[PDB]
């Protein structure tokens, strides 16, 4: 599971055992990133991000890892940040063009497929390098329901009920599988998200951190929004207190 | 990308182009081809590498390309590259003809192709054309002419020369036997038969192994003809009957 | 020019006249206006002659490529699509008026194709300067599911109507019969037109033309 | 198209491709040129005298215009390219400007061309050096030289090619206002310089001269033999009756 | 020779000294990295696809996990190998089909679709700038006259029609099984075909699957529209195998 | 081992730019002195043969009537930048009807700094940096100015500056003798002195070139006699 | 995003060899064998179409392909490359027909296809085709048989073999075959020279045959090939 | 050493060495600091001279009436980015007749600088920026890295020996939001000062100041126009 004899210098080159190591290395860059999770319930989708603070000099809300891709579509990223931003711009443009050409808000599965094809386009040639980030797209509509998709550096796109990316992926997933989100509401979910984040955080290796939270559902009339300071601090308190047990 | 680039248009530390020289090496392993100038014509004579019992023979020749109604050429190296270059030569000749409404001088045609080959040596990152050429022709400026070009886009005019396998030996032999201002098509034919007979690895020499073409001037028109196997055998027999004649004297 | 096409029980009958005019002067008395598209598809052409020639040849070529690749016999819809899209792309500047007919796996099919790229699928069509006469013949004497000889008679009648009532048309009548298992490229069907026999002999005898200069050139 | 940096800097600050080009020049036939008063002469060494070869087709002394001639050393093909481009520019100068062409101008054009080929993607430096010779309007005679780098300078006399250092030294020691006081003396100086590196002959020396508003004059081997004869005579009437 | 290498013949798609293309073979190996196996069988009046549906996590919307794709209303495909590459190739196939109908006025035949995709892959095989796709496409559909059709294309550029094929890990074994079961000469019916494919996959991996561990695509003469079976009907096919 | 022309060293620099800086260290040394009475530029010609006409060696050129430039290193590369500068001044004159500031010209030439590269570029783009150091000496509204530019593109104003092989020594010598109230005569004198110190050949009238730009006088290249009158006062 | 490698992948060795071309030829001399015989009144092309399972539908892909109505093709080497060359050859033929309104002479088609093959030995970012072609044709009364190799060179043959054991097939042809043969006898000796290698029972579905007389090129029906493979008919 | 020379090549551990090496170019530049009050945004920069007979490098550039920058690294890349920012601001005023929001300008810089970190033969921008601005959301200090990443700072310092400044700033953050202009520039100057040995200190020769605010367009002070700021500082002794 580690061949590096020139077989890992280009995305236009297979390894003798049928692998593309550049994509794997980009994935590894995602693995070294702070954890971000997203979870889908019966009236929307909620996002949570462990945003590591590298300096107290940085303002509150700097280096956001939560994006508005469209008025109905939110985005949570993990990995090389600039890449994530570029992909956010791509997603935005795709959604915009879809609206201009077809008249209505782009379906999430389609936006996912498009952006994912765009990502996959960077895993074929030596002229460019794969995106060092994975991202989640969340949306809600009455005609489609609540939807949550995830895309990795290879270009793979899947639909999820709950998902996580970054350092503590599997631990976060284990914490997530304890929830019955198919019956809970986003309201109840925010607390659980914050909770899982606070659990999964490693205060020893990583110093201070900031919690990012995102709504998108029936409570917001389909608009992807930031979690109010009130609900956010409530969930944080619930988390800190749940951490002492 | 920078990794896979073989860097074909690049100087070597000694100040030379490796791919051009290697191409010359490829040429060295090709069918022997020589040309001799005379006062009443000029000729090409070349070794045929396409000599197998099951070949069908549908063309006038194998290594003798007609370029123009007043000009022909022979080749040595990779044959496909030769097809490319010969096609281009024809194109050039017709362009000149369209422009000036008179045949292109031979030197101009040769230079025109050689600039393309040179261009291939200087930029593009492509391999050069592994081909040397011999040009025979006539024009109203310099009369009968023989030229030679290498894959470097370098060319020269000759009174006699050779190209291909065992070229150097052939050149020495030519230096011995040639006859400045005293050359005829008959004598030159004999010389060709001689040098070809010595340079060719396969001795005895059958017409199945050689290909001769002459360019001559008859009645205001230019005539280019490929010798039939019969005439060739006449020439060879003449060579042997002259060789067995000078060996009696001892 | 008068060209027509009809759909009968077993296939398709195409018809054309053979006059080619430059202005109001007959240049050709035996012009071929029925073009090969594919072994099962043929096309009559009116409008700008060179344009119909090149269009029809190009489509024939592309269709040969198509069938060569598919290993199957071409469909008429394919010819129609290629023609109409090419023609639309050029906005009527390619003056090809066409009667396209053939037999498929789906049966016989007849389209009329206009130079702007519009098409019509119809049991009977006419194009050209003599198209209204032929159309009159059709609208008077056409019935669905005709037999071969009846259809041939109808089409030849329409082409004749055009020939004798249009100054743009004349000379002979060409038919092309295409069925599920036969191809009758009759050329020409019947010449209802003849030059009258020469009453005189205007033959000039050797030496009657004065010559200033002669030059004999032997060949081989 | 091919967009790759061929000519780049080395850690010691050298342009290796240009140096190798200069080596290619150093493997070239020796070419020398001297400037006189009303005459300018250029002579080139080894003509690769195969004798089976037409000399006319292998001359290393070309004319760019009626005003300017030139010799070279290096890769003959590259030389052909640069020469023809120089010719085109010589005519375009006449088109764009009623006046003909100055030697320094065309020298500058050629130089800039080479430099351009030292700094462009995909391209490879011209492996030649040129001796440009001419008479400008106003009558001043001039000799310049270029280099695969793009640098160019004026000279009173110079040499390029195989053993350029030797002939340069000889010219340094022999160039006087006494020598080249007459045309026949300048030509003599050129032949004398060339015979100091050539395989000692006269059938291996090509010599061309330009003078005044007159055209370029190439010297036939008879005249060259005559000059080399008067040379050997003076080399035995001022060097024999002394040592 | 016999496994010799020279230059970059193991990095880009150029010839090895014995005239092989290593990168292509590596792509074939890259197909198996998915760890899945697909079976395709042609009947007398139908064509059937079946593939493992490995969903190791409940955090997934099974509904989005599929290797079965609709190329056209009457043309179905199964992909095996690298996922993203597979979806790329699926998009390309869809485009080629739509474009085909737009230009030629009739529905594209499976033969020509597969040939087209393969033709495209050959370019990746011959150009150095890009690497082959680590995927394998099997198309099924009903042609107008030739009956039911199963075709398949390679990362090498090979394509062919089959009575039965398979792709992935258990490929050779599935081929052995199927080529054994074809020689018998039995009434290749709808149920016979479905059961044949399912049992091929099952025995080759040995499972007696749940109806949620595989997915079955199908196309019939009576119903040419490519249909993806519900878990219910799949189970209905499962319980019928545990009777004889 | 071959890498791209736009590759960073682990230290955070471009190899090609640094190697170009190295390439300057072989160039003829040049001296510029800024003074309220004018700016002077002096450079050695480095004649390698008595056969070489030294008047065909110009390492000091006129950018415009109020701006001169002294160059060191690969002169062939310098010619391009000089021409670009001249064209720039003339365009500025054409558009605005007023002369360019020395800093503006310098900045203009400096804009062609790291304009090299392989992929993602025009087919007529530069493949490598310019291996040349420049000294611009001019006069404008801010008075006499002197700027220095290197292949990094970084340009800076200087009171007295030396470029070339003997850069360090000459710069030290300059530091020892410069004050913001010298006369132009003292400047020229000093320049010629330090130049003679660092030059390997004997300083004479046909061995260096010297040029001045003063507020009352356009760019002037000193003649042979004008040079002799100065070298006299060694 | 993508552009393209603009340098040659095929370069001269110091020995003077174009290594990639010779490796391509190595790829040819590893493929199923093919035979071509020119026989006075016609031409025969035949090849080993041996599948790898009974599952393969041999009635779907062919090795003997028509280029036009009077020209046919077979190959030895890599399939996909051959397919590319077939499309290209057909296109070239049709261009010729559009310009001259006359069926393309076999030699001209061979020359154009050979030019295409030569391009891929010098143009940037590509390897040469791993395919040798046998091209049969009927033009100007006479029959024609050519072979084109990956270098882009072509040769006219009276008869030849390519692929595995092509040397022994070639000798077999040199002895057990000559002129004045009718197309039938030629088919006979063609299946005979293919049988000098076809390891196993050579059935009517194990080989593919195509003919070219002055009535056009066509692929032989499996029935006709069975009748010929009855060591008779 | 094989994952060193191309930006398109990931290392086996999930890093891109060309980007990091590019980041190292920031540290080679003279230190610069930037801080904001609630009304003003201030850049202070330690200029730097080759020899004593050379002037001190420009460190602060004007972009728009409400936006200025301080550079650290390759000066050519700095001028490149500067021209880009100027053009974007001009475009915004041309089309909308309103000044371009600082955060959006920064976002544009991120987008532009990300591009060549993914294309073969391209290199990252070898320059770090501190951006001082004022808009409808008040004063702003931004930081841009060669990694194409950007940060909204409350205060920051970059360049050689800037860790000290970073520490000092990190101590006096709570004061900044209520400081007056003189005090703000003071703090910036002290932060810049801690980036020097005890031997050397600030001068009217090696310090540039840049201020923008609610009552002041972006302005650059140096030479004698800096003196009023310096002459009001505590002679911090070792």
Curated annotation (Swiss-Prot), chain A:
Highest taxon in the source lineage: Eukaryota
Coiled coil: none
Example GO molecular function: ubiquitin protein ligase binding
Main subcellular localisation: cytoplasm
In-chain residues carrying the UniProt-annotated modification N6-acetyllysine: 56, 205, 229
GO annotation (BP), single: proteasome-mediated ubiquitin-dependent protein catabolic process
Induction of expression: Down-regulated by antioxidants BO-653 and probucol. Up-regulated by bacterial lipopolysaccharides (LPS) and TNF.
Residues modified to Phosphoserine: 242
Modified residue annotations for N-acetylserine: 1
Annotated GO CC locations: cytoplasm; cytosol; extracellular exosome; nucleoplasm; nucleus; proteasome complex; proteasome core complex; proteasome core complex, alpha-subunit complex
Location in the cell: Cytoplasm; Nucleus
Key words of the record: Acetylation, Cytoplasm, Host-virus interaction, Nucleus, Phosphoprotein, Proteasome
Family: Belongs to the peptidase T1A family.
Protein name, entry field: Proteasome subunit alpha type-3
Gene name in the database record: PSMA3
UniProtKB/Swiss-Prot annotation, chain D:
Location of the protein in the cell: Cytoplasm; Nucleus
Post-translational modification comment from the UniProt entry: Phosphorylation by ABL1 or ABL2 leads to an inhibition of proteasomal activity and cell cycle transition blocks.
CC annotations in GO: cytoplasm; cytosol; extracellular exosome; nucleoplasm; nucleus; proteasome complex; proteasome core complex; proteasome core complex, alpha-subunit complex
InterPro entries noted in UniProt: Ntn_hydrolases_N (IPR029055), Proteasome_alpha (IPR050115), Proteasome_alpha-type (IPR023332), Proteasome_asu_N (IPR000426), Proteasome_sua/b (IPR001353)
Keywords: Acetylation, Cytoplasm, Glycoprotein, Host-virus interaction, Nucleus, Phosphoprotein, Proteasome
GO biological process per UniProt: proteasome-mediated ubiquitin-dependent protein catabolic process
Glycan-bearing residues: 129
Main location: cytoplasm
PROSITE patterns listed in its UniProt record: PROTEASOME_ALPHA_1, PROTEASOME_ALPHA_2
GO molecular function, one term: identical protein binding
Induction: Down-regulated by the ribozyme Rz3'X. Up-regulated in colorectal cancer tissues.
Signal peptide: none
Record PTM Phosphotyrosine, positions in chain: 152
Modified residues (N6-acetyllysine): 226
NCBIfam families listed in its UniProt record: PRK03996.1
Family in the record: Belongs to the peptidase T1A family.
Role according to the record: Component of the 20S core proteasome complex involved in the proteolytic degradation of most intracellular proteins. This complex plays numerous essential roles within the cell by associating with different regulatory particles. Associated with two 19S regulatory particles, forms the 26S proteasome and thus participates in the ATP-dependent degradation of ubiquitinated proteins.
Protein name (database record): Proteasome subunit alpha type-7
UniProtKB/Swiss-Prot annotation, chain G:
Post-translational modification Phosphoserine, affected residues: 6, 13, 15
Compartment(s) where it occurs, according to its Swiss-Prot or TrEMBL record: Cytoplasm; Nucleus
Transmembrane segments: none
Keyword Transport: no
Biological process, per Gene Ontology: proteasome-mediated ubiquitin-dependent protein catabolic process; response to virus
Record-listed N-acetylalanine modification sites: 1
Residues annotated with Phosphotyrosine modification: 5, 23, 75, 120
Name of the protein in question: Proteasome subunit alpha type-2
UniProtKB/Swiss-Prot annotation, chain H:
GO cellular component: centrosome; cytoplasm; cytosol; extracellular exosome; nucleoplasm; nucleus; proteasome complex; proteasome core complex
GO molecular function: lipopolysaccharide binding
Glycosylation positions in this chain: 107
Cross-link Glycyl lysine isopeptide (Lys-Gly) (interchain with G-Cter in ubiquitin) placement: 112, 205
Record-level GO BP terms: immune system process; negative regulation of inflammatory response to antigenic stimulus; proteasome-mediated ubiquitin-dependent protein catabolic process
Positions where Phosphoserine occurs in the chain: 107, 174
Induction of expression: Induced in breast cancer tissue (at protein level). Up-regulated in liver tumor tissues.
Short name of any one Pfam family annotated for the protein: Proteasome_A_N
Keywords linked to the UniProt accession: Acetylation, Cytoplasm, Glycoprotein, Immunity, Isopeptide bond, Nucleus, Phosphoprotein, Proteasome, Ubl conjugation
Cell compartment(s), UniProt: Cytoplasm; Nucleus
Function: Component of the 20S core proteasome complex involved in the proteolytic degradation of most intracellular proteins. This complex plays numerous essential roles within the cell by associating with different regulatory particles. Associated with two 19S regulatory particles, forms the 26S proteasome and thus participates in the ATP-dependent degradation of ubiquitinated proteins.
Family: Belongs to the peptidase T1A family.
Identification of the protein by name: Proteasome subunit alpha type-1
């Amino acid at each position: 599971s580690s061949i590096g004899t020139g077989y890992d210098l280009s995305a236009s080159t297979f390894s003798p055992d049928g692998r593309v190591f550049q994509v794997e290395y980009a994935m590894k860059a995602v693995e070294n990133s702070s954890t971000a999770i997203g979870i889908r319930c019966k009236d929307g989708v909620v996002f949570g991000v462990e945003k590591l603070v590298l300096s107290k000099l940085y303002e509150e809300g700097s280096n956001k890892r939560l994006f508005n891709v469209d008025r109905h579509v939110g985005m949570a990223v993990a990995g090389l940040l600039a890449d994530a931003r570029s992909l956010a711009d791509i997603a935005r443009e795709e959604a915009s063009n879809f609206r201009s050409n077809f008249g209505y808000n782009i379906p999430l599965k389609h936006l996912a497929d498009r952006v994912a094809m765009y990502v996959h386009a960077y895993t074929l040639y030596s002229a460019v390098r794969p995106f060092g980030c994975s991202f989640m797209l969340g949306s809600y509509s009455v005609n489609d329901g609540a939807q949550l998709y995830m895309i990795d550096p290879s270009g793979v796109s899947y639909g999820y009920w709950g998902c996580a990316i970054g350092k503590a992926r599997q631990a976060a997933k284990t914490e997530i599988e304890k929830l019955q989100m198919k019956e809970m509401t986003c309201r109840d979910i925010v607390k659980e998200v914050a909770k899982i984040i606070y659990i999964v955080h490693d205060e020893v290796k990583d110093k201070a951190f900031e919690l990012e939270l995102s709504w998108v559902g029936e409570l917001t009339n389909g608009r992807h929004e930031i979690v109010p300071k009130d609900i956010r601090e409530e969930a944080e308190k619930y988390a800190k207190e749940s951490l002492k047990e | 990308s920078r990794r896979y680039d073989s860097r074909t248009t690049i100087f070597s530390p000694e100040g030379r182009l490796y791919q051009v020289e290697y191409a010359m090496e490829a040429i060295g392993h090709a069918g022997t081809c020589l040309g001799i100038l005379a006062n009443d014509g000029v000729l090409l004579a070349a070794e045929r590498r396409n000599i197998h019992k099951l070949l069908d023979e549908v063309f006038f020749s194998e290594k003798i390309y007609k370029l123009n109604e007043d000009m022909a050429c022979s080749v040595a190296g990779i044959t496909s590259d030769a097809n490319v270059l010969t096609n281009e030569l024809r194109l050039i000749a017709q362009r000149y003809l369209l422009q000036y409404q008179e045949p292109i001088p031979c030197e101009q045609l040769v230079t025109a192709l050689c600039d393309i080959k040179q261009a291939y040596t200087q930029f593009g990152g492509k391999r050069p054309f592994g081909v040397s050429l011999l040009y025979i022709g006539w024009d109203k400026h310099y009369g009968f002419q023989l030229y030679q070009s290498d894959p470097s886009g370098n060319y020269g005019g000759w009174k006699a020369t050779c190209i291909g396998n065992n070229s150097a030996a052939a050149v020495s032999m030519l230096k011995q036997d040639y006859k400045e201002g005293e050359m005829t098509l008959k004598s030159a034919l004999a010389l060709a038969i001689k040098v070809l007979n010595k340079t060719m690895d396969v001795s005895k020499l059958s017409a199945e192994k050689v290909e001769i073409a002459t360019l001559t001037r008859e009645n205001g028109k230019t005539v280019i003809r490929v010798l039939k196997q019969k005439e060739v055998e006449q020439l060879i027999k003449k060579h042997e009957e002259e060789e067995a004649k000078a060996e009696r004297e001892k | 020019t008068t060209i027509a096409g009809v759909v009968y029980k077993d296939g398709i009958v195409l018809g054309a006249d053979t006059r080619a005019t430059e202005g109001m002067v007959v240049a050709d008395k035996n012009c071929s206006k029925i073009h090969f598209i594919s072994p099962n598809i043929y096309c009559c052409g009116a409008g700008t002659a060179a344009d119909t020639d090149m269009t029809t040849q190009l489509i024939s070529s592309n269709l040969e490529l198509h069938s060569l690749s598919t290993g199957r016999l071409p469909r008429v819809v394919t010819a129609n699509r290629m023609l109409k899209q090419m023609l639309f792309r050029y906005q009527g500047y390619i003056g090809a008026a066409l009667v396209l007919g053939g037999v498929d796996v789906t049966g016989p099919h007849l389209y009329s194709i206009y130079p702007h790229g519009s098409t019509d699928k119809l049991p009977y069509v006419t194009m050209g300067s003599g198209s209204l006469a032929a159309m009159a013949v059709f609208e008077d004497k056409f019935r669905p599911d005709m037999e071969e000889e009846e259809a041939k008679n109808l089409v030849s009648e329409a082409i004749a109507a055009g020939i004798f009532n249009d100054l743009g048309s004349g000379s002979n009548i060409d038919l092309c019969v295409i069925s599920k298992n036969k191809l009758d490229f009759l050329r020409p069907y019947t010449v209802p037109n003849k030059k009258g026999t020469r009453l005189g002999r205007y033959r000039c005898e050797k030496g009657t033309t004065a010559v200033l200069t002669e030059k004999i050139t032997p060949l081989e | 198209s091919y967009d790759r940096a061929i000519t780049v800097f080395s850690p010691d600050g050298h342009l290796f491709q240009v140096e190798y080009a200069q080596e290619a020049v150093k493997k070239g036939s020796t070419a020398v040129g001297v400037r006189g008063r009303d005459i300018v002469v250029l002579g080139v060494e080894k003509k690769s005298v195969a004798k089976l070869q037409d000399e006319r087709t292998v001359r290393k002394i070309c004319a760019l215009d009626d005003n300017v001639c030139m010799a070279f050393a290096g890769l003959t093909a590259d030389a052909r390219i640069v020469i023809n481009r120089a010719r085109v520019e010589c005519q375009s100068h006449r088109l764009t400007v009623e006046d003909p062409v100055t030697v320094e101008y065309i020298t500058r054009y050629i130089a800039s061309l080479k430099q351009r080929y030292t700094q462009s993607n995909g391209r490879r430096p011209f492996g030649i050096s040129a001796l440009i010779v001419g008479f400008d309007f106003d009558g001043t005679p001039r000799l310049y030289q270029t280099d695969p780098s793009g640098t160019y300078h004026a000279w009173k006399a110079n040499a390029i090619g195989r053993g350029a250092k030797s002939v340069r030294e000889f010219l340094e020691k022999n160039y006087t206002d006494e020598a080249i006081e007459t045309d026949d003396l300048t030509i003599k100086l050129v032949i004398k310089a060339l015979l100091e590196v050539v395989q000692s002959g006269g059938k291996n020396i090509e010599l061309a001269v330009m003078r005044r508003d007159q055209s370029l004059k190439i010297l036939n081997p008879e005249e060259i033999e005559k000059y080399v004869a008067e040379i050997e005579k003076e080399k035995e009437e001022n060097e024999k009756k002394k040592q | 020779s016999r496994g010799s290498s020279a230059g970059f013949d193991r990095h880009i798609t150029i010839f090895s000294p014995e005239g092989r293309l290593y990168q292509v073979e590596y792509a074939f190996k890259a197909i198996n990295q998915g760890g899945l196996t697909s079976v395709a069988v042609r009947g007398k009046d139908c064509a059937v696809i079946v593939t493992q549906k490995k969903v190791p996590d409940k955090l997934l919307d099974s509904s989005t996990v599929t290797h079965l794709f609709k190329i056209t209303e009457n043309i179905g495909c199964v992909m095996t190998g690298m996922t993203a590459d597979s979806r790329s190739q699926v998009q390309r196939a869809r485009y080629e089909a739509a474009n085909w109908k737009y230009k030629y006025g009739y529905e594209i035949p499976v033969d020509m679709l597969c040939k087209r995709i393969a033709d495209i892959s050959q370019v990746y095989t011959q150009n150095a700038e890009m690497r082959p796709l680590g995927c394998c496409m099997i198309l099924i559909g009903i042609d107008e006259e030739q009956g039911p059709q199963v075709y398949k294309c390679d990362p090498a550029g090979y394509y062919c029609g089959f009575k039965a094929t398979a792709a992935g890990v258990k490929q050779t074994e599935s081929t052995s099984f199927l080529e054994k079961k074809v020689k018998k000469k039995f009434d290749w019916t709808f149920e016979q075909t479905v059961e044949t494919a399912i049992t091929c996959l099952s025995t080759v991996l040995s499972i007696d699957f749940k109806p949620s561990e595989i997915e079955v695509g199908v196309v019939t003469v009576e119903n040419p529209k490519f249909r993806i079976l519900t878990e219910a009907e799949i189970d209905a096919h499962l319980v019928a195998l545990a009777e004889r | 081992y071959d890498r791209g022309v736009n590759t960073f060293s682990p230290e955070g620099r471009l190899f090609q730019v640094e190697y170009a800086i190295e390439a300057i260290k072989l160039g003829s040394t040049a001296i510029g002195i800024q003074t309220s009475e004018g700016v002077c530029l002096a450079v050695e010609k480095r004649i390698t043969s008595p056969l070489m006409e030294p008047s065909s060696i110009e390492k000091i050129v006129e950018i415009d009537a109020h701006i001169g430039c002294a160059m060191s290193g690969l002169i062939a590369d310098a010619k391009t930048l000089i021409d670009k500068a001249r064209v720039e001044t003339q365009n500025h004159w054409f558009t605005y009807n007023e002369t360019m500031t020395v800093e503006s010209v310098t900045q203009a030439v400096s804009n062609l700094a790291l304009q090299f590269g392989e992929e993602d570029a025009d087919p007529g783009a530069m493949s490598r940096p310019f291996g040349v150091a420049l000294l611009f000496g001019g006069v404008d509204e801010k008075g006499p100015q002197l700027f220095h530019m290197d292949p990094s593109g970084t340009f800076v104003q200087c009171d007295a500056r030396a470029i070339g092989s003997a850069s360090e020594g000459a710069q030290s010598s300059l530091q020892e003798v410069y004050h913001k109230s010298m006369t132009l005569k003292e400047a020229i004198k000093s320049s010629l002195i330090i130049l003679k110190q660092v030059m390997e050949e004997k300083l004479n009238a046909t061995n260096i070139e010297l040029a001045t730009v003063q507020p009352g006088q356009n760019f002037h290249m000193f003649t042979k006699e004008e040079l002799e009158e100065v070298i006299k006062d060694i | 995003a993508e552009r393209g490698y603009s340098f040659s992948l095929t370069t001269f060795s110091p020995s003077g060899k174009l290594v990639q071309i010779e490796y391509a030829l190595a790829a040819v001399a590893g493929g199923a064998p093919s035979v071509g015989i020119k026989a006075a009144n016609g031409v025969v092309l035949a090849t080993e179409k041996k599948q790898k399972s009974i599952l393969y539908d041999e009635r779907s892909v062919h090795k003997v392909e028509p280029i036009t109505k009077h020209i046919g093709l077979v190959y030895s080497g890599m399939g996909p490359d051959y397919r590319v060359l077939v499309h290209r050859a057909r296109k070239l033929a049709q261009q010729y027909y559009l310009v001259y309104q006359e069926p393309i002479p076999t030699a001209q088609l061979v020359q154009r296809v050979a030019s295409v093959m030569q391009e891929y030995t010098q143009s940037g970012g590509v390897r040469p085709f791993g395919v040798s072609l046998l091209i049969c044709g009927w033009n100007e009364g006479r029959p024609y048989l050519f072979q084109s190799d990956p270098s882009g060179a072509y040769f006219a043959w009276k008869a030849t073999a390519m692929g595995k054991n092509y040397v022994n097939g070639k000798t077999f042809l040199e002895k057990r075959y000559n002129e004045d043969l009718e197309l039938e006898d030629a088919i006979h000796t063609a299946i005979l020279t293919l049988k000098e290698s076809f390891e196993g029972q050579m059935t009517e579905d194990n080989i593919e045959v195509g003919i070219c007389n002055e009535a056009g090129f066509r692929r032989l029906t499996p029935t006709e090939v069975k009748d010929y493979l009855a060591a008779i008919a | 050493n094989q994952y060193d020379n191309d930006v398109t090549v990931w290392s086996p551990q999930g890093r891109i060495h060309q980007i990091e090496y590019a980041m190292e170019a920031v540290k080679q530049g003279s230190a610069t600091v930037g801080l904001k009050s609630k009304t003003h945004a201030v850049l202070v920069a330690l200029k730097r001279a080759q020899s004593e007979l050379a002037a001190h490098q420009k460190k602060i550039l004007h972009v728009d009436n409400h936006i200025g920058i301080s550079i650290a690294g390759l000066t050519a890349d700095a001028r490149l980015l500067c021209n880009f920012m100027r053009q974007e601001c001009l475009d915004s005023r041309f089309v909308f007749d309103r000044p371009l929001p600082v955060s959006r300008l920064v976002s544009l810089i991120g987008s532009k600088t990300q591009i060549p970190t993914q294309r073969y033969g391209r290199r990252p921008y070898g320059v770090g920026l501190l951006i001082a601005g004022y808009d409808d959301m008040g004063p702003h200090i931004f930081q841009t890295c060669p990694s194409a990443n950007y940060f909204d700072c409350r205060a920051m310092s970059i360049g050689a020996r800037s860790q000290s400044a970073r520490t000092y700033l990190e101590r006096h953050m709570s004061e900044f939001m209520e400081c007056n202009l003189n005090e703000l520039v003071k703090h910036g100057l002290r932060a810049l000062r801690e980036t020097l040995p005890a031997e050397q200190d600030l001068t009217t020769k090696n310090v540039s100041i840049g201020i923008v605010g609610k009552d002041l367009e972006f302005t650059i002070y140096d030479d004698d126009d800096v003196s009023p700021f310096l002459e009001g500082l505590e002679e911090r002794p070792q």
